């Protein structure tokens, strides 16, 4: 008895919390898709129907890649006169929106309003993270880990500290693009300087929207850096070192976290 | 042959012993062969053989008393329990479930089926308290185990029995269902505190069935309609997609086939 497959209508939120947006609300073939601040109204140009045939449609026309090589733009196009393969997309649990024919992924290579969307080689960067939802705000939460301690930001540094609900520095904004941002400075991002084990994670500008700034909360309690395969890890299970690192998955308590809101 | 048994004692309980207990419960509720949007699905009730329908949870406490809860693997929920030579069962929902529970505790001397099911509404009515005014934690569970035990000897009256079910169901069934609620019970043990569940916990419990449906019927994780949840302070927010739920939900009731 097979599960129903519905066609939800949702916004698509991505880099820096901006929305997938048919530019100027115009729907002639070839008009560019862009990042734009998420609206609260019913305008069609930000409301996407996730059709059963793996198309993504606004005002009845298709989100369409201009081509199958990295860096080309993404546009609105008549679903039946567009090349069919160019209108097909899969939406992955880890936040990637991929075009199967090309294996390239939807991307915003700049973070400004008006940035034209492109397809790019998948590197699981923040510039390639998306969420289908009508939530225009990030999910604000504390992040609790080893010994019940709270992830805490102090300027550029991050460590775990005794939890206090009074502490804004222990509040985290989980953005649609996969970035984890200190509540007090939403232009900053939980950042690993590399894809390599034992790199100490820091708080740095979200400007690069890089592979080292995208994170996924997994079902086993770990927080995974998608590109590297490494998880967030309280170094040597020792909070007094004030260092959180990337480390290969073992699932011991120093790798287990929980979003408590 | 007996159903699988998992053990927990409140005597000397630690964050680690409770975590190991809950993980072992999840490992016997489902194989993990059916995982949807990274969230394991419980076995489908339809055609599930009776010898695979239940698991047992033997609880012990500092007073050296034990009871054994029976859990339905299709929804992780308590269906009854055994204390000594007596078994006690929630009112079955249907004829097939009434036949099914006769396979539990088959050598027990006495068996009693209550007038009430195990839904919270009625248990709260019987207990005289809502979930938001019933403390959870290792202390409450220690007391619930004693209460469940002494019901068989005439030493526990119905409101205390109802409150004890509410405690056990949340600390065992809902914790198995939700990493979030397992974490909440972990915190109570960590700090040796008892406290009632905040609105985020209660609303998750209330929404488990609808969340399972929404995720399994989603188009690639996007819901057809939102699920409303609450923050710890009672404020409301809506969830439109499975992403934020992946670390929050650990098991779903089987709703349909992939």
């Amino acid at each position: 008895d097979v599960c129903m497959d519905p066609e939800p209508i949702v916004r698509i939120v991505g880099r820096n919390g901006l929305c997938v947006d048919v530019r100027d609300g115009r729907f002639h073939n070839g008009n560019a898709i862009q990042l734009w601040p998420c609206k609260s109204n019913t305008d069609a140009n930000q409301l996407w129907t996730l059709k059963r045939d793996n198309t993504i449609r606004s005002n009845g026309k298709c989100l369409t890649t201009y081509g199958y090589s990295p860096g080309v733009y993404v546009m609105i196009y008549d679903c039946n006169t567009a090349a069919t393969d160019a209108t097909r997309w899969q939406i992955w649990d880890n936040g990637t929106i991929i075009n199967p024919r090309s294996s390239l992924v939807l991307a915003a290579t700049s973070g400004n309003s008006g940035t034209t969307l492109t397809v790019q080689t998948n590197i699981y960067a923040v510039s390639q993270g998306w969420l289908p939802t009508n939530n225009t705000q990030p999910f604000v939460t504390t992040i609790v880990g080893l010994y019940g301690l709270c992830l805490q930001a102090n300027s550029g540094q991050v460590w775990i500290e005794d939890c206090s609900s009074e502490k804004a520095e222990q509040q985290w904004a989980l953005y649609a693009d996969g970035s984890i941002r200190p509540q007090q400075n939403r232009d900053n991002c939980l950042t690993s300087d590399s894809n390599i084990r034992e790199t100490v994670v820091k708080i740095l500008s979200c400007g690069p929207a890089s592979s080292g700034q995208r994170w996924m909360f997994k079902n086993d309690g770990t927080i995974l850096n998608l590109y590297s395969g490494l998880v967030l890890d309280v170094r040597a299970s020792d909070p007094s070192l004030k260092q959180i690192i990337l480390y290969p998955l073992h699932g011991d308590p120093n790798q287990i976290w929980l979003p408590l809101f | 042959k007996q159903y699988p048994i998992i053990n927990f004692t409140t005597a000397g309980a630690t964050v680690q012993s409770y975590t190991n207990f809950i993980r072992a419960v999840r490992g016997r509720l489902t194989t993990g062969a059916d995982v949807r949007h990274e969230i394991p699905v419980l076995p489908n009730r339809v055609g599930l053989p009776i010898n695979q329908r239940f698991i047992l949870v033997e609880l012990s406490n500092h007073a050296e008393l034990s009871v054994t809860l029976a859990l339905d693997v299709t929804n992780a929920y308590v269906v009854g329990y055994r204390a000594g030579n007596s078994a006690y069962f929630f009112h079955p929902d249907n004829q097939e479930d009434a036949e099914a529970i006769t396979h539990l505790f088959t050598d027990v001397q006495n068996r009693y089926t209550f007038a009430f099911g195990g839904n919270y509404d009625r248990l709260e009515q019987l207990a005289g308290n809502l979930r938001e005014n019933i403390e959870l934690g290792n202390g409450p569970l220690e007391e619930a185990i004693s209460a469940l035990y002494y019901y068989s000897t005439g030493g526990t009256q119905l409101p205390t029995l109802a409150r004890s079910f509410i405690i056990c169901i949340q600390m065992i069934s809902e914790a198995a269902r939700f990493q979030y609620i397992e974490g909440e019970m972990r915190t109570r043990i960590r700090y040796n505190r008892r406290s009632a569940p905040d609105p985020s916990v209660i609303t998750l419990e209330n929404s488990w069935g609808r969340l399972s449906t929404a995720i399994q019927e989603s188009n690639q994780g996007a819901f057809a309609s939102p699920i409303q949840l609450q923050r710890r302070n009672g404020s409301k927010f809506s969830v439109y997609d499975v992403s934020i739920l992946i670390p929050i939900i650990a098991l779903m009731v089987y709703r349909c086939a992939p």
Epitope: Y147, G148 | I189, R190, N192
Partner: nanobody
Framework: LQLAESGGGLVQAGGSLNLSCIAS????????MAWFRQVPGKEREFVAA???????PYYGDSVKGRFTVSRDNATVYLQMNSLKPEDTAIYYC????????????????????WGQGTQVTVSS
């Protein structure tokens, strides 16, 4: 209920020792185990504690990453490394019960069960 310390002795500066604290009995109501030290004429000084519920360690100010307090299946240990002459003292293990909350007991008057102490002497 009796606590017994072991493992004290003589070492020279920069050396290491490992103390152990064994209870006569296992009670299941303990909240914290702790190590203290005392020299003549001074109050007893908090050295280290271990939260029973989850194993979280805590250390006094003068043990500057040098010691490790830990627990085994079935005994609490204090691994002391890079020992300075200022660490010479009688070391005591202590037990606290019924603690509730997010902090930790760290003063002598918050622990009611005490071993007799073992002498630690650091040379040079």
């Amino acid at each position: 209920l009796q606590l017994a310390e072991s493992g004290g002795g003589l070492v020279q500066a920069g050396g290491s020792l490992n103390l152990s604290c064994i209870a006569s009995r296992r009670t299941l109501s303990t909240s914290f185990m702790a190590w203290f030290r005392q020299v003549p004429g001074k109050e007893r000084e908090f050295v280290a504690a271990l939260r029973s519920s989850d194993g979280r360690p805590y250390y006094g100010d003068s043990v500057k990453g040098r010691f490790t307090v830990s627990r085994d299946n079935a005994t609490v240990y204090l691994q002391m490394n890079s020992l300075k002459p200022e660490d010479t003292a009688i070391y005591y293990c202590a037990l606290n019960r019924g603690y509730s909350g997010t902090g930790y007991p760290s003063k002598q008057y918050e622990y009611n069960d005490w071993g007799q102490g073992t002498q630690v002497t650091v040379s040079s």
